[PDB]
Amino acid sequence: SLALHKVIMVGSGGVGKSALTLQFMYDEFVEDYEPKSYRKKVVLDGEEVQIDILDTAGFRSGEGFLCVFSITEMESFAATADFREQILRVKEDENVPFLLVGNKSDLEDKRQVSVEEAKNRADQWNVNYVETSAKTRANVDKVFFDLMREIRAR
Ligand SMILES: Nc1nc2c(ncn2[C@@H]2O[C@H](COP(=O)(O)OP(=O)(O)NP(=O)(O)O)[C@@H](O)[C@H]2O)c(=O)[nH]1
Ligand SMILES: [Mg+2]
Ligand SMILES: [Mg+2]
Fold this sequence. Notes:
Blueprint: E1 4-10, H1 17-26, E2 38-44, E3 47-55, E4 64-70, H2 74-78, H3 80-91, E5 98-103, H4 115-125, E6 128-131, H5 140-152
Parallel strand pairs: 1-3, 1-4, 4-5, 5-6
Antiparallel strand pairs: 2-3
C-alpha cells in the first residue's frame, strides 16, 4: 500500500488545467486539444508514491490544490481569489496544501499578469508561486511534486 496524494486542479476555463495534467501524466501536449481522475506512480524524494489528479472543468476529498490561472489573462488571475476562498471554506482548513500556478509562460509576449503581481498575492496567501508551460514542459513536474511535498507534510 503506497501513499496516495490527492491533487485537485482548479482555475478558470482555458487556463490549462487539462494540458498541465496531460503533460505531467503522459508527456504529451497537443495545442487546441479539449479533453475524461488520473493516477500515476512516481518517486517522491526516494519514496514511491501514487498521485491522483482530479482535472475538473473550470473537491472535498482533495488533499492539495493547484490554483491555476493564465499569465495571458488577468481575468483568470482575478478569479483565483474566489477559488481560494471557496477551497478554504469547503475544506474548512486554512492551511490546506495550495500552490498558485501561472500557466502558459511560453506566451510571454501576451502576458497580462506580471510576476511581481502574482508573487504579491502568493505571499499574501503564504503560498508559493510557480510559472509553468504545458507546451515547453517548464516547471510542470515541479508544481505537482512540490504540491505533493506540501501534502506529505500535513
Ligand atoms: N501555448 C500554450 N498553450 C497552452 C498551455 N496550456 C494550455 N494551453 C492551451 O490552452 C487551451 C486551453 O487549455 P486546457 O488545458 O483545455 O484548459 P482548461 O483549464 O483545462 N479548460 P476547461 O476548464 O474548460 O476544462 C488549449 O488550446 C491548450 O492547448 C501552455 O502552457 N502554453
Ligand atoms: Mg479542462
Ligand atoms: Mg518565462
